[PDB]
Amino acid sequence: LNERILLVDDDYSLLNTLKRNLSFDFEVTTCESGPEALACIKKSDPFSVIMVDMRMPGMEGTEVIQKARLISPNSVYLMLTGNQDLTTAMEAVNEGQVFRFLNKPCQMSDIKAAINAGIKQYDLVTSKEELLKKT
């Protein structure tokens, strides 16, 4: 079971808050931006789950997911999304880029359920691949 997850958000306060809570059940890495996230995926072992915040200075979360899927195809990408980003989150889901998005503010519960759902999804994907790969 891959429980390695990557959190991407501009805000260190929120990152520390999520990582404190999430580190009881998962292995959590944090990154402050898209370029930082892109550097981290390229050199680390596969993350099963990667969540990105929609609004960040410079590179928006949707671009980060689109670039990361070229580098880490199996990963399951989740997005934190505001009110005003719904449409962009919806078309991202429909393109098959975003597994799940979460409307802010988000309850811890909702977040942990998304992550668990993502981990399970990751296992479906790589299980099917690991069995094509041998047979």
Place this chain on the structure above:
Amino acid sequence: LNERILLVDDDYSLLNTLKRNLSFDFEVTTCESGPEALACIKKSDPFSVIMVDMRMPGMEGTEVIQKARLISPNSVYLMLTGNQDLTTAMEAVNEGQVFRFLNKPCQMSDIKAAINAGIKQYDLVTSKEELLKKTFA
């Protein structure tokens, strides 16, 4: 590859248009209502993909999906909604129940893409489930 799909909508005019186009690629069944969909799901072979309209008289799409999830758990559920009913459907669905929402009216190609993605999703789910149960590889 399971390519049996179930379309559930109130309006026969839209059912006919979708069954006409989708039948070139898929094995399509149509139902005009929730109770009609639930009957069809009990008695049929499993559908890989089930698509339900949000607004229907008597029983709405969301209730239909959550009732169908207890009869056909592996099925992938797609939900057709007007963008006006969308957040209502999102507040009313709990995570995992709807795989993909689609806007009405909807480009045929968004529809085919959602359905293909459902079919591939259905294949992942049931492939894992046989690995966990089959005795002989």
